[PDB]
Amino acid sequence: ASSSFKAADLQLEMTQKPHKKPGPGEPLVFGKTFTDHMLMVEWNDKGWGQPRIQPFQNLTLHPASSSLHYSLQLFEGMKAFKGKDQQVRLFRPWLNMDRMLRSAMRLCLPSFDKLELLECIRRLIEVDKDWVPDAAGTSLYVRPVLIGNEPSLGVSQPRRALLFVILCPVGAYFPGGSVTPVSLLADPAFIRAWVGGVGNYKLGGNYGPTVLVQQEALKRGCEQVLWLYGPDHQLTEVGTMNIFVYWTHEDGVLELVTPPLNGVILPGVVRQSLLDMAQTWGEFRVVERTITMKQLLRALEEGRVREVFGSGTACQVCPVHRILYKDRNLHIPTMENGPELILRFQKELKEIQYGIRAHEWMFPV
Amino acid sequence: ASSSFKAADLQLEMTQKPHKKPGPGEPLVFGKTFTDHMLMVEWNDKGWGQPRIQPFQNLTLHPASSSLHYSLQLFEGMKAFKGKDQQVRLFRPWLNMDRMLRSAMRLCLPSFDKLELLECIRRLIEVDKDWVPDAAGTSLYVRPVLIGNEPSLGVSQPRRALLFVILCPVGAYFPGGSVTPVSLLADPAFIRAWVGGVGNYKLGGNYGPTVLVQQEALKRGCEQVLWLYGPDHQLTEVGTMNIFVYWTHEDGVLELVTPPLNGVILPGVVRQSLLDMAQTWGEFRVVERTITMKQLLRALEEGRVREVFGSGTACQVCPVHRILYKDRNLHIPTMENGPELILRFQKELKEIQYGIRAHEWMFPV
Ligand SMILES: *Cc1c(COP(=O)(O)O)cnc(C)c1O
Ligand SMILES: *Cc1c(COP(=O)(O)O)cnc(C)c1O
């Protein structure tokens, strides 16, 4: 009664202007197409209003809105998948709710009950169940967002906020049983986040500044940015992805490594999962630890590196075959080693996500 | 870039819903009250549209707007002052245009011609001329904003943007001829910007994360945050203000020092001006150098510190009498030394800003 909105009070408003779905020919470029409905909940000094599913529509915002002046905004990104039996499922939606909540706190935005939001999302996706593609490799992208909405140029804790969710079908990222590597630009010139910063939260502010760097990565001939940090150029993340390395370490032990959640990297859901899986298999050392370019160069020379890749909801797993550093093109042997591990990861997630094998990680819609 | 919009094509829609000025006894709380009109220019596939002054109104934005997901937003803050002859004037508006433009480039937003925007702003202020307060110490706050407006969840260079300006009368911050100090929280726990970061640009993303820390500063019993950086806790800025110190250095020379424009600092307009003035007077060493808490502690005990303060458009100059560091309350002698330096700076700016003495820094409206 001044804490959280409840799914039980959700309000439905089916559209009166259904939109033509992307014909079976239609491309489906990442975030360019949206479904018919959206979720919407308002918050002010009266607590949350009633959550409501409404037709997709513009946002009406006051010119002084803090979401626009002081970046009082955060968002989440997760996927729902439709299996061959056309049942739709989310991938560990809970971890996303957690993260959203944590970001919400960092920006002094109002908290809410994750189960209620999750259910509300489940109701929304349900409403647009038809928008979920089901061609192999495709999915529905779930975009929850929360922004401060005070019509005040004061940089204070907002007293008015707004949470909303939008959905878009996304097409396949790789052919059924393979993957294609990407080249990375690695330049100390740019930092993405720092210690004591806010990079371990998914806030809009973390991304705005990457657009320029991303272009520099392309003009320089690469496709993504490997973010280096500190004086030893430690690897943090690869653009909107957590970085992983499968190699024989200096101590001669075969292991899967990924930078620790110090506070400069984002707690990827896929990231978590890949560790979970690997720790399960028990076939090799799985460790969270700092990785430095130094260690990487030497591991490359002595040929101890097998696979390098990033994790993320866009493709789950993505191979790396080239890293441009100090104007030096480093060939990464990922494809030459299978990529054995990447494919397994890829294969296991697909069977879990598309409902080939039942699993606790999947939240049915 | 595209060919800037031109003032000559400015389109004017006068309001039919004049809000009525704040009663002559109504608290001009910063960023709370807005005037009747706003400026608005759109940008897209076809370069800039026509700039237009229109009635203050909400912004209609697509749910996927990049200004809301990846913080593709920046803004500027400057003041216009009305003299007793009712002539309105801006304070070095050019430096603001420059800065705006630089921020615009860092986020890959479209460029525009500084002079055209300035004229457009001059036209808008002209239109709301009556909204500029006359009380000594008051002013009109000018808030230009530029945001990416791509209805796309893709984190790319926008192809659709929007620039707009809103205005609000602000009341006095100090009574005439005096000032009141503020206490600062100085904790290495929090970092505002980093080297190679984007703190030297006025981007919304820089601020969102300060709201929490600001509350912690009040909770700790302070009023503003002194941002410390690096391993030696070098002073960077004091919240939305540049920090200045008037002290005898370790070499025995009396000087006014302020952190250099190394990139972790915002190029304040007031900051620039205070240096210009001091440089002019030629009465003491004026320098841009790194300042470390170490140096400050030692100056305090040896008594070499006279005045400490920050610069910013909100109050021009603001005294500091206390800095809480390591749970240690440091008394700063600012008020005990006049504060002579601060008073002079405050006197000079007032006479320039309110048109008591003509000056090249003032841009008439
Ligand atoms: C999206 C993203 C990740 C990965 O998160 P997932 O939950 O796996 O989608 C990691 N780092 C950054 C900077 C990201 O944007
Ligand atoms: C507003 C601000 C300043 C001061 O700039 P002015 O142009 O003099 O107002 C300095 N640093 C930060 C972080 C600011 O927000």
Swiss-Prot record, chains A, B:
Compartments reported by the entry: Mitochondrion
The EC number(s) this enzyme carries? 2.6.1.42
Which of the residues bear the PTM N6-acetyllysine? 294
Q: Which residues bind substrate?
A: 141
Q: Which residues carry this modification: N6-(pyridoxal phosphate)lysine?
A: 202
Known catalysed reaction(s)?
A: L-leucine + 2-oxoglutarate = 4-methyl-2-oxopentanoate + L-glutamate; L-isoleucine + 2-oxoglutarate = (S)-3-methyl-2-oxopentanoate + L-glutamate; L-valine + 2-oxoglutarate = 3-methyl-2-oxobutanoate + L-glutamate
Q: GO MF annotations for this entry? A: branched-chain-amino-acid transaminase activity; L-isoleucine-2-oxoglutarate transaminase activity; L-leucine-2-oxoglutarate transaminase activity; L-valine-2-oxoglutarate transaminase activity
Q: What does the protein in this record do?
A: Catalyzes the first reaction in the catabolism of the essential branched chain amino acids leucine, isoleucine, and valine. May also function as a transporter of branched chain alpha-keto acids.
Q: Which PANTHER family match?
A: BRANCHED-CHAIN-AMINO-ACID AMINOTRANSFERASE, MITOCHONDRIAL, SUBGROUP IIII AMINOTRANSFERASE
Q: Protein name, please?
A: Branched-chain-amino-acid aminotransferase, mitochondrial
Species the sequence originates in: Homo sapiens
Q: Organism classification, top ranks?
A: Eukaryota, Metazoa, Chordata, Craniata, Vertebrata
